[PDB]
Amino acid sequence: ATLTSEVIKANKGREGKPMISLVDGEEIKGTVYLGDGWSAKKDGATIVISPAEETALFKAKHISAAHLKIIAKNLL
């Protein structure tokens, strides 16, 4: 699959807030890895999330608990 390589390349560690869909190249301020394959879990005091996916050929992404607060603001 190219979803994992294609989506991560679009944005990686750039203050999750602005998301561009290379599908039609457009700025979507108010989305965070949404509409791609966002997946995460709560570890308690530190969230673990992979932008679009993770197949051993890529890596996870950290998120401070406070940063998790920013993601909710982005969607709504």
Swiss-Prot record:
GO molecular function terms attached to this record: type IV site-specific deoxyribonuclease activity
Function recorded in the entry: Internal protein I is one of four proteins in a complex that functions in bacteriophage head maturation.
Protein name from the UniProt record: Internal protein I
Taxonomic lineage: Viruses, Duplodnaviria, Heunggongvirae, Uroviricota, Caudoviricetes
Full-length numbering of the shown residues: 20 to 95 of 95
